[PDB]
């Protein structure tokens, strides 16, 4: 509920992206765990990259996550985007089964190919 970021995010294939999420700068909130997770269907809200050193197998070589405590912000970079990465995601702090999150929507569109006569 005190967590805020960009609600909708658009890009095309091959491009990069940069997402920023905001939190109150209290000292519990700076030292706690930050996470980026993909809220799929069928129950879970599986984590993709975290603040403690976890990077998933699908995000290897593509992503990182940086915590800036004096801003109260943390940034997520994701390179080499595809069309299977369209879905609903979440920022957050702490444990996933609580609700200190914020919903983000990401749509990736198909680029140009073999129609370039304009």
């Amino acid at each position: 509920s005190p967590i805020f970021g960009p609600e909708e995010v658009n890009s095309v294939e091959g491009n990069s992206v940069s997402i920023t999420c905001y939190y109150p700068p209290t000292s519990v909130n700076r030292h706690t765990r930050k996470y980026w997770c993909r809220q799929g269907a069928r129950g879970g809200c599986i984590t993709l990259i975290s603040s403690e050193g976890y990077v998933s197998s699908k995000y290897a070589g593509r992503a990182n996550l940086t915590n800036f405590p004096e801003n109260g912000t943390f940034v997520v970079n994701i390179a080499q985007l595809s069309q299977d990465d369209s879905g609903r995601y979440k920022c957050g702090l702490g444990i996933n089964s609580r609700g200190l999150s914020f919903d983000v929507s990401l749509e990736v569109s198909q680029g140009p190919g073999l129609l370039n006569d304009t």
Binding site: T26, S27, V28, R30, H31, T32, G94
Partner: protein
Amino acid sequence: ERIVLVDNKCKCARITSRIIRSSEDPNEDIVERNIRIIVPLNNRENISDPTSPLRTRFVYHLSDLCKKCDPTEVELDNQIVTATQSNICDEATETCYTYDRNKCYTAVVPLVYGGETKMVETALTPDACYPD
């Protein structure tokens, strides 16, 4: 589920309320009240380590959750007076069932260092106990 009356974090209990202006009989309406209890299955009785086994009994008194004893400010005539807000707050002393994200909880353990012993201090909730 509209207006919060009680948000207690020593017992982890939350009470909300809402006037549901119902459809049928449109000149009368109901008052709904929602209560939410989250019960921890691995906490101790006192919050220290070896106390007593895990708590298995949890008691909630709504006359204590709705209590209000901090002084307030009231403008009567052209004045500011201070008043109380409750009849029963003759006295912390309450027992807590859960932790709280914004408070430290520490302990003291004696360990040996070759010669004498010390009074080494140990953090029980490590996120909230950085000196900052």
